[model samples]
Target chain A: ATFGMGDRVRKKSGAAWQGQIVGWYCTNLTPEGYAVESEAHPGSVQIYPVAALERI
Target chain B: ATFGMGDRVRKKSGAAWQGQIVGWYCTNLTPEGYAVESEAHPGSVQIYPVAALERI
Candidate 1:
């Protein structure tokens, strides 16, 4: 796993919204992604590809 | 998946320590289990088998 639970992360480029990786999505057909809980926006979480995120 | 990320849960038996399912551990040989973040004990998370937990 590129990121573990509770790992702080941000977008690799553009407007960086820092967040903590809280969960993940995985399937047999699709690649896994991180569910990042946003610090700037509480109660808001977004999924992003591994390449799009960088540890903060 | 027995419990999802952010799902409120507790042990099926014994002293019920309420918590939220935060993460998971899975392997090819072993069955998947949850990493529950304890409410009674903040910052302390534990892994439990699916049979050991229930939705709260």
Candidate 2:
């Protein structure tokens, strides 16, 4: 929860990626979440919970 | 080339998808463009040109 939008992140799960926080995307749980574009998989956006993201 | 932001799409490639367009995202090529969150593939976003997306 230390990072803000535009910061790069790697998924704590499978496939490490170069992700950029595009916006403040909230789901059912976290209010301070984000949508992302991973350079590793260019062509779609993905959302992440605050705990799942790691600044890189 | 008819879809705008928030429109859904299926990829022309092997993996058909459920994608949502975000902003007017373009690098230095086509004037019309987009960024995304693929419903088919959650937790990750991929970029695609308008020509690559099919609205539905």
Worst-scoring 10-residue span by lDDT in model 1 chain A: A24-33
lDDT of 1: 0.70
Q: Judged by DockQ, which candidate is best? A: 2
> What is candidate 2's fraction of native contacts?
0.00
* lDDT of every predicted structure (CA atoms): 0.70, 0.64
Which candidate leads in TM-score? 1
Give the per-residue lDDT of model 2 (tens digit) for B1-56. 46777787766764344567765665678666666665644544556677766777
What are the chain B TM-scores of all models?
Answer: 0.82, 0.64
CAPRI level of candidate 2: incorrect
lDDT of 1 by residue, B1-56 (tens): 87787899989887666788766654322256666667878655666667788997
Off by over 4 Å in 2: A14-17, B1-56
